[PDB]
Design a protein around this motif. Sequence first.
Motif, PDB file in Angstrom:
ATOM      1  N   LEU A   1     -72.125  28.634  -3.196  1.00 28.11           N
ATOM      2  CA  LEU A   1     -70.685  28.844  -3.130  1.00 28.11           C
ATOM      3  C   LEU A   1     -70.035  28.539  -4.475  1.00 28.11           C
ATOM      4  O   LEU A   1     -70.383  27.559  -5.124  1.00 28.11           O
ATOM      5  N   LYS A   2     -69.082  29.379  -4.879  1.00 29.69           N
ATOM      6  CA  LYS A   2     -68.379  29.229  -6.144  1.00 29.69           C
ATOM      7  C   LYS A   2     -66.895  29.484  -5.959  1.00 29.69           C
ATOM      8  O   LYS A   2     -66.501  30.379  -5.217  1.00 29.69           O
ATOM      9  N   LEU A   3     -66.072  28.714  -6.659  1.00 24.97           N
ATOM     10  CA  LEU A   3     -64.619  28.806  -6.518  1.00 24.97           C
ATOM     11  C   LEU A   3     -64.093  29.725  -7.576  1.00 24.97           C
ATOM     12  O   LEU A   3     -64.637  29.729  -8.677  1.00 24.97           O
ATOM     13  N   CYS A   4     -63.048  30.479  -7.235  1.00 19.54           N
ATOM     14  CA  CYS A   4     -62.292  31.289  -8.189  1.00 19.54           C
ATOM     15  C   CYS A   4     -60.815  31.353  -7.798  1.00 19.54           C
ATOM     16  O   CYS A   4     -60.383  30.734  -6.816  1.00 19.54           O
ATOM     17  N   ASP A   5     -60.050  32.101  -8.592  1.00 14.03           N
ATOM     18  CA  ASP A   5     -58.642  32.387  -8.347  1.00 14.03           C
ATOM     19  C   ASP A   5     -57.778  31.117  -8.518  1.00 14.03           C
ATOM     20  O   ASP A   5     -57.194  30.612  -7.576  1.00 14.03           O
ATOM     21  N   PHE A   6     -57.699  30.625  -9.745  1.00 10.96           N
ATOM     22  CA  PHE A   6     -56.955  29.404 -10.061  1.00 10.96           C
ATOM     23  C   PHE A   6     -55.488  29.629 -10.461  1.00 10.96           C
ATOM     24  O   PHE A   6     -54.893  28.788 -11.133  1.00 10.96           O
ATOM     25  N   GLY A   7     -54.907  30.752 -10.043  1.00 12.36           N
ATOM     26  CA  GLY A   7     -53.538  31.118 -10.431  1.00 12.36           C
ATOM     27  C   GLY A   7     -52.429  30.246  -9.843  1.00 12.36           C
ATOM     28  O   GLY A   7     -51.337  30.228 -10.378  1.00 12.36           O
ATOM     29  N   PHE A   8     -52.681  29.559  -8.724  1.00 12.94           N
ATOM     30  CA  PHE A   8     -51.680  28.673  -8.122  1.00 12.94           C
ATOM     31  C   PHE A   8     -52.056  27.211  -8.410  1.00 12.94           C
ATOM     32  O   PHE A   8     -51.370  26.302  -7.973  1.00 12.94           O
ATOM     33  N   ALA A   9     -53.128  26.980  -9.162  1.00  7.69           N
ATOM     34  CA  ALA A   9     -53.611  25.615  -9.390  1.00  7.69           C
ATOM     35  C   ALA A   9     -52.675  24.801 -10.299  1.00  7.69           C
ATOM     36  O   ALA A   9     -51.963  25.366 -11.121  1.00  7.69           O
TER      37      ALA A   9
ATOM     38  N   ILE B   1     -56.970  27.598  -1.645  1.00 10.07           N
ATOM     39  CA  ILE B   1     -58.344  27.781  -1.183  1.00 10.07           C
ATOM     40  C   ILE B   1     -58.285  28.618   0.096  1.00 10.07           C
ATOM     41  O   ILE B   1     -57.558  28.273   1.013  1.00 10.07           O
ATOM     42  N   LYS B   2     -59.059  29.698   0.145  1.00  4.98           N
ATOM     43  CA  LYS B   2     -59.145  30.566   1.319  1.00  4.98           C
ATOM     44  C   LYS B   2     -60.442  31.374   1.264  1.00  4.98           C
ATOM     45  O   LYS B   2     -61.042  31.484   0.202  1.00  4.98           O
ATOM     46  N   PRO B   3     -60.869  31.953   2.403  1.00  3.92           N
ATOM     47  CA  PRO B   3     -62.156  32.654   2.384  1.00  3.92           C
ATOM     48  C   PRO B   3     -62.265  33.727   1.299  1.00  3.92           C
ATOM     49  O   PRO B   3     -63.322  33.862   0.707  1.00  3.92           O
ATOM     50  N   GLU B   4     -61.179  34.433   1.000  1.00  6.29           N
ATOM     51  CA  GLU B   4     -61.206  35.492  -0.034  1.00  6.29           C
ATOM     52  C   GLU B   4     -61.631  34.997  -1.402  1.00  6.29           C
ATOM     53  O   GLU B   4     -62.252  35.742  -2.127  1.00  6.29           O
ATOM     54  N   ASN B   5     -61.316  33.754  -1.770  1.00  7.18           N
ATOM     55  CA  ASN B   5     -61.716  33.275  -3.080  1.00  7.18           C
ATOM     56  C   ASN B   5     -62.887  32.282  -3.129  1.00  7.18           C
ATOM     57  O   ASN B   5     -63.078  31.569  -4.109  1.00  7.18           O
ATOM     58  N   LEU B   6     -63.680  32.268  -2.067  1.00  8.65           N
ATOM     59  CA  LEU B   6     -64.940  31.556  -2.040  1.00  8.65           C
ATOM     60  C   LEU B   6     -66.089  32.568  -2.178  1.00  8.65           C
ATOM     61  O   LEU B   6     -66.438  33.292  -1.227  1.00  8.65           O
ATOM     62  N   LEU B   7     -66.654  32.626  -3.376  1.00 11.48           N
ATOM     63  CA  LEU B   7     -67.753  33.537  -3.685  1.00 11.48           C
ATOM     64  C   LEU B   7     -69.056  32.892  -3.209  1.00 11.48           C
ATOM     65  O   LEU B   7     -69.223  31.689  -3.343  1.00 11.48           O
ATOM     66  N   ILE B   8     -69.939  33.688  -2.604  1.00 12.76           N
ATOM     67  CA  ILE B   8     -71.237  33.209  -2.124  1.00 12.76           C
ATOM     68  C   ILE B   8     -72.371  34.051  -2.709  1.00 12.76           C
ATOM     69  O   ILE B   8     -72.461  35.258  -2.451  1.00 12.76           O
ATOM     70  N   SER B   9     -73.223  33.418  -3.500  1.00 14.93           N
ATOM     71  CA  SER B   9     -74.302  34.130  -4.202  1.00 14.93           C
ATOM     72  C   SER B   9     -75.409  34.585  -3.254  1.00 14.93           C
ATOM     73  O   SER B   9     -75.405  34.254  -2.056  1.00 14.93           O
ATOM     74  N   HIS B  10     -76.361  35.337  -3.807  1.00 15.21           N
ATOM     75  CA  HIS B  10     -77.550  35.784  -3.069  1.00 15.21           C
ATOM     76  C   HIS B  10     -78.377  34.574  -2.610  1.00 15.21           C
ATOM     77  O   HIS B  10     -78.960  34.598  -1.530  1.00 15.21           O
TER      78      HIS B  10
END
Length: 276
Positions: free
Chosen positions: A134-142, A121-130
Motif C-alpha cells: 500500500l502507498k499513499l498519494c494525493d497530498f493536495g489537502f495535506a 485519506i480515502k480508497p481512491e488515493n490508496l495505491l496497492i502494488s502487485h
Amino acid sequence: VMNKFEILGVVGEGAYGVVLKCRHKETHEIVAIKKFKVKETTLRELKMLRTLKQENIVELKEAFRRRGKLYLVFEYVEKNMLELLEEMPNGVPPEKVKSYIYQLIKAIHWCHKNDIVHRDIKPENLLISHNDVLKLCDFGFARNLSETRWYRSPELLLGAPYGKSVDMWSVGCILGELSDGQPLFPGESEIDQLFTIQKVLGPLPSEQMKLFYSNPRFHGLRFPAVNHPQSLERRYLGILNSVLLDLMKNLLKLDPADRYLTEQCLNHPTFQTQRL
Ligand SMILES: N#CCc1ccc(Nc2nccc(Nc3cc(C4CCCC4)n[nH]3)n2)cc1
Ligand code: NA
C-alpha cells in the motif's frame, strides 16, 4: 516529453485532471503521468512528497512542460483500493483487511512523525502494488502542523481546529468498508454527512455542537438531530470480529481527543497477535 514517453492508456480522469499510463522509450520504465487541464497547492505537495520519500509513499520522479502545460511523472502502481472494492463489492478477506489497515497506519505514522497530516485519506488515493504493498498519494489537502465527504471526521466537517486525529477517523471508515464492501457514512451533503455519522455513533459531543452554531458557514441551518442511533456493535455484528470491532470503536471516537493515534494502534491486539 511525449517525445520520450509512449502513452499506454488512461488511468483516470476527474477533478484531479488526467493520469496517463506511459512508458519511457529508451529505458522502458512504466510511469504514471499527471497532465493538467501551476498553483500553490501543486508546489506545497511536491515539497511534502520530497520530505516523505519512502516505499509506502508514491514517488515523484520528474516534472516537465510541453508548451506551458505541466506534466508530473510518478511511480506507477497497478491499482487503487477503490478499484479493488469494485472487483470485490462484498469486502476482502479478513487477512487482507488487517494487512492493508496495518500498512495504512504505518504510512500515516510516517507522515505524522514528519508533522504532516494528510486530511483526505480515502480508497481512491490508496495505491496497492502487485505485491500488495500500500502507498499513499494525493497530498493536495495535506498540512504541516507547524504552520468525497464520506471519509472526513466531524471536526473537519465543522471547520474545527484539527490535528493528527483527523487521519485516524479515515482509517476507521476504511476498515469497515474493506470488511463488507460498503461505505460506512455515505452522506449526500455536508449536513447529511453529520446526520449519517450520528445515526451510527449517536449525538455529537458538546464542543462540536457549539461549533455548528458559532461557525457562520452553517448560519440559519437546521442541526441534523438524530432519533434512534444504531451503534457500531449492531452495524458490524457478523462482519467484524471482536478484536477489529474494538479497534474500530477507538478510531471512530467522535471527540478527536479520544481517538487512538498511530503508535497506540500498532500496540493493539489487532496487530500484536500472531496466528497460531
Ligand atoms: N492525482 C491523484 C490521485 C489519484 C490516485 C489514483 C488514481 N487512480 C489510479 N487507478 C489505478 C491505478 C493508479 N496508479 C497510479 C497512480 C499514480 C499517481 C499518484 C499521483 C498521480 C499519479 N501512480 N500510479 N491510479 C487517480 C487519481
Ligand atoms: Na504495481
